[model samples]
Target: STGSATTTPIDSLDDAYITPVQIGTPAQTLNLDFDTGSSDLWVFSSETTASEVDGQTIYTPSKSTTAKLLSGATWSISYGDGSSSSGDVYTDTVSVGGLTVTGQAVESAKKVSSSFTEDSTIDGLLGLAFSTLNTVSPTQQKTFFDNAKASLDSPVFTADLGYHAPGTYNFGFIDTTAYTGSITYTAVSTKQGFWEWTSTGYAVGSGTFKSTSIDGIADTGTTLLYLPATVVSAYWAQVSGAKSSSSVGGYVFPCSATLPSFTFGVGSARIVIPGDYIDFGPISTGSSSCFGGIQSSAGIGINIFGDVALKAAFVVFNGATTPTLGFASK
Candidate 1:
């Protein structure tokens, strides 16, 4: 079986991507972030305190005949930004696009971080990472992707993120027309519970590709690209007014400065990120300083090829044994 769905950016800045999902028997549709960086499909629910709830659409298991409580099960998860959420678990029928999964573990949020509450555009998150990263307690549960993989024609999914536009997420198959050029395949390691792979190298603007191994994760949940300090510094150096400012919390440049495109190697293939993408946005409303989409990962410990980079190409998350990632220019 195969399924497809349109994923759209929540804001003009492309802060997060959201896809509509159907839950329960009557198909209560909610916008969820298709996060690949974490495991555990969680959502705001009637169980959450009124004070904690913002404008998000909440899931109410009590209203669904198919919803069954996972008696002693509960789950909690934290993100890189220190934001967190926790809730009880329920098994119910859930559908994404045209694919349906029965008895899918759905964690109903009893509590959520302030950041989550403030972001009314997102109702919850549907994790697509490996099942090993699931946060359910007593008995861990599989992610929506993991549970649906076996039924899918192929145990794989693809992420085609966009810039200020709607993209798509396809399960069981890759849409050939979604990308151009031949796909470049690379081996991936799931040891860290992430879609981690080693990039061949990188180059600034029209510079030659530097032959170096850069390890990173293709995280659709994150908003920006993070690389080694040296690599990040090298890219910013090309912009005349760029500087690593502690006050700005990242590399920022004059809004009027001409930015250079960034290129990274996926095996022998190169994906170029347009310069406009690197100019993330103004540091503040109508500010002259613009924040960069690429930042140093020195403090982060692990490099992340987030949405900024993913938007430039199509990515395949292969779930076959000895998993691999496929990249193709769009």
Candidate 2:
């Protein structure tokens, strides 16, 4: 069976992809960020503080007959951008698209940081990472994908993350019509429970490509592209007015400046990040500078080919065996 879902971009230009998911017996639907960066399915629920919840749809577990609270079980999670959430656990039927997984462990948020509270659009996070990274206390819980994998046609899912446009996430079956050319297969190392891989090389500007292997993960939840500092520094050097500024975070460039595209290796196929996509967005109002989405991964340790990078192509997260990543141009 195939389960398909469409995701909307938070901003017109793009930030994160939000997918609809239903929890509990009666079904309380919430828009979640389908994050591949980490593992945990959490949502803003009846447990959230009144002041903390802005305009999100909260899950009322008490109203669902199928909801079963896991006494003493709790979870707390944090992100690269400082967004965080913590809450208790409940087992309920979770549905995505037409796929339903009963007895799915759902984390209901009781506390959230300002970073999460301010973003009213996001109801919660749906982690697509490995079950090894699950955060539930006492005993770890499996992700929605993990519980549903056995019934799927094959242990594979595809993400069509696009810029400023609607993208799709397909499970159980691969849709061959969504992408162009043949999908290039790359061996993914999930040692850290992430779709991590190394590029054969990368090129900056119009220069020839060099074998500068970059170890990074394909993360749909991340909004920007993160690389090594030296790698970003080289890209900015090619840009006329770009500079690394702590005040603005990473490299900042003039909005009016012509930006350069960046290319990296993936199974001998190079996916070039359009210069326009590199400029994440304006730092703030009344500022002429924009943040370079591409930055050093010094803090996060592993580089992240976030949404910006993922949207450049069609990606397949294969989980059958020896987890592999298949990429094709859109």
Candidate 3:
């Protein structure tokens, strides 16, 4: 069995990508952010407080015939951005694209942070990371992908994130037409419950590729790309009038400045991020300064190859017994 879903950017800057997911017997559809950085399939639901409910859709488990409470089970998860949600757990028939998973854990949010309430782009998050990262207590549950992988044609999923356009997510099979050239496979370390891997090195624009090891995670949940401070500074240094502004936060440059592309190495393959993709729109509406899509990961503890990087290439999350990551130029 296989599934294919089209994910669209929530905003003009491609702040996040969301795909439609159907849950329950009658299929309550909601737009969910497929986050590989976290492991929990949580959603805003009828259980959530009215104050926290804005324009987002809610999953009413009571309205679904297949919904059954996972007695005594509870889940709470927080993101690096500080937004969080906690709720009761339910087992329901969940579907993504055309793939279906029976008895999938669907956490219905009872409470949510203000940040989550304010963001109308997403109704909830669907975690694709390892099940070990699941926050459900007493009995941790497997993610939707984990439950569905066994029935898939192949034990893998792929991400094709776009800059300002709709991209795709595939489960069970890789779409050969989605990318070009041969894919470079790299070992993944699921020890931390993330699709974490180390890159061979990187190059700024037309500069030489630095042969250094940079460990990072391919996080679709994150909006920007974060790298070592040295690498970030090197990239911005080439742009005229660019500054690491405390007020603007991170690197900002004149909107008119010509930007240079970025490249990262995966084995022998080098994926180039177009310069336009780095110009992450204006700092403020109608502002002359623009914020960069790449930033310093100094304080973050781990580098993040977020949408800024993921959008540049086709990525495969091979969930074989010994998982591996494959990268291809698109």
Candidate 4:
């Protein structure tokens, strides 16, 4: 029997998708950011300091009949984006889109960074990365997908990210209707607990595609597409009035400027990123400017195929032997 589940994205200022999950016996519902870059199921729980929680819903383990404390167990996490959280641990049942997994480790936040506490829509994060990266003390824990795999018809999940609209995440199954054309599969390497893959090459605008293998991660939690500085410079060079602005941050251009599409080779397939998706939205601090959604990964070490790139196609996260990724036109 496959554990089928579907998640809907939350409208956010940061452009991240949020999915709801029920925890504990009485079923306390919380909307969490499903992150593929990190591996932990953390929530703003009762254990969170009163001063630490602002406008977010918190989980109360004591209210649930099935919640149990894993004595002395703790967790702390810091993301590449600078958000952080730390807390104690609770063992309980967690349900997502009607599928439930018992005894899943739920890390309850006792302390959280301002970015998380201030985000009104997100109550926590559900990590979809490999379980080996779970941050629990003493013994690591399994992700919701990892724990539910034994019951799934196939060890697979699909991410159908949308542009300015609510996208979907389907677990244990892929809906053929969500995308068009044949899915081109490429082998994925998770040596770092992320859906790590290398691009066969990339191209800017109608420019000839260059063959350059680049290592990167598929991160749903991130808002933009991050690549090498040389590639970023080449992209903005095609747009008039576009400049690297410190005030606007990253590359900025006139809101009315025409932007070129970005395309990258995934094995034998070419995934074209629409021009509109490269606009990271309006500049708040400046005049008539907009932010570039594509930037340099720089010191971050690896390129990031974030929401901007992910939304361009239907993506499959296969968890079977040697996890592979499948992409198709949406």
Candidate 5:
């Protein structure tokens, strides 16, 4: 029989900027953004100049009793958001919760751009998504999932976010009781950082999309959902007198009417987005509106189903065994 387990809900604010994680032994904590859009564990370093290390927590290896640098390897990473950092490689004993993984590879940025330096609250990013986006060697690179798998009892990690509350990020085991029944599993594609998925269909409020369903990826890191132009237009068509407005460089719908609900197929599982996501507030002077969840990314290569959509169900990143992913509840 399985041992009795404890269930902890990982909670966070709707706009709370950062999630903190512990690195090295004796626990040195750093505020980090948990991003599924990319798979890299990077921290600022004191070795870097102040200009390059600005606004991020510089991990001083000399001060840590458990730090090790990889010999003769250079590392750099660039994000789609036009932010990037580069540095040498290092390894140290890392831990999250009660799970500990040793000799985990990490990046130490020697040079950073102003975009990264300007973010006062964002110190670093802890990628719990996948290893394909890792900058280190395929042989040496190990993600948090890779290390946590062996130590966790259930080989699962689940995140539960609180509305304007402290979101809990849990590891090792999943509380099966959280869901109503058996989990519907989807085969993970061997993609990069983002978990690319196929949307079989869509519906707004009670209306459904008549054209080819949108293709997109589910990312935990991004806070909002990005839809294609055609789909966006189709969604607004059902909203009575909903006009388009611009905000945060994206087109949004401003309306008070209950927007249609949307459903997407993940393998055999179907997930739904409620109407609240469509109830966007006004951002411009015109009679236009935007949804709280959907936004526009004109030239971005992929559609992102951000945290709002993810909050509907339980998500599991199975890196502890092989680089696989699973979904369950509670």
Candidate 6:
């Protein structure tokens, strides 16, 4: 389960990372990823080798002015992207925003991979998905929310993702300033970590592509937004000189031209993907390649609006009310 907190001075504007209410506390500073795909709170630790801890922030319990570790418990986590790490369990007094929660379950990695160790951008992750999917079992450990729930005034949390920007992720309480009306709530299904939904259709560059309706799920753990082939090809057609390049294992288009704005008709609400995020990285010199924000995943049996899409909007996972995810403009 994800929780909320306020902002802290952890870094300068360029090097700043998003601190969540569960992981960003004034008591103990932490770097956390606002993940909607999985439910887990894990941090790198000093106990890990320098190689594994290279790009990640290592949480040194001894350095925390206030916090403790749960002795004797070991923790490890693996991601769908083939990244993995292992560490010892520790109980600490953690704070997010201005709220302090004691006895928070923290995973300090002792072993980590190059992908995790080399990423200097983020320090750790504060999973904002489902409680059942938590790497730290409720039977053996408590989550940041499980410990802080008793102390929260509203007991609610919202995630304000800053589109493609790094520092825009906010947690703890919903910032009403970001939305125009009362936040919408969806009922959570009985299932574990998946947020269920029905897709109305797909649109690319202001074009309504298909009429097929489908049930879907939203996951933050995934990095790419997946769509049906028919819709994918139609949407990609809008990109100038956009073609499927097997060289990169996905669609690639001439990045020099101005990219088109694409939106998805998810039931009644519409989510849009900006052109800048569509061409995220420089594929080549002189002419960059436009990365496909939406990819074909019909073979995968379901549609996933991964981080690329989620980065464009403010989302809220309301487990306390219903099994639904709320969306708003940031």
Q: Candidates' lDDT values, in order?
A: 0.93, 0.88, 0.94, 0.86, 0.63, 0.62
TM-score of structure candidate 6: 0.82
TM-scores of all candidate predictions against the true structure:
0.99, 0.97, 0.99, 0.95, 0.80, 0.82
Per-residue lDDT tens digits for candidate 5, residues 1-330, read 111212222333243236666677666777777776677788777766686655566677777778887888667788766888887877887665555677877677788778778765666777766676777653447577656566667676665543333445667666665555556655555555556655555656556544355666667767666778777676667667665554355545545566677655555566666666434355544545544566555688778777666665566655444444555433
Q: Return the top candidate by lDDT.
A: 3
Q: Lowest summed-lDDT stretch of 10 residues in model 4?
A: 5-14
**All-Cα superposition RMSD per candidate:** 0.8, 1.2, 0.8, 1.6, 4.4, 4.1
Can you give the lDDT of residue 139 in candidate 5?
46
lDDT tens readout by residue for model 1, 144-236: 888888899998999999988999999999899999989999999999999999999999999888989999999999999999999999999
Residue 310, model 3: lDDT of 94
Superposed by TM-score, candidate 6 places the C-alpha of residue 274 at a distance from the truth, in angstroms, of: 2.8
Cα lDDT tens digits, model 6, 242-293, are 8887787678877676777767655466667776666645455555675666
With candidate 1 superimposed using the best TM-score fit, by how many Å does residue 228's alpha carbon deviate from the native? 0.4
lDDT of 3 at 2: 96
**lDDT at residue 105 of model 4 (Cα atoms):** 93
Angstrom error at residue 287, model 2:
1.7
Total backbone clashes of candidate 5, pairs 3 or more residues apart or in separate chains: 21
Name the lDDT of candidate 4.
Answer: 0.86
What is the Cα-based lDDT of residue 293 in candidate 6?
A: 62
Per-residue lDDT of model 4, residues 105-190, tens digit only: 99999999998888778999999999988999988889988998877778898888888777778778888999888898987888
lDDT tens digits by residue: candidate 2, 69-119: 988999988887887889999999999989889999999999999978888
Across 53-126, the per-residue lDDT of candidate 3 in tens digits comes to 99999999999999999999999888887788999999999999999999999999999999889988799999
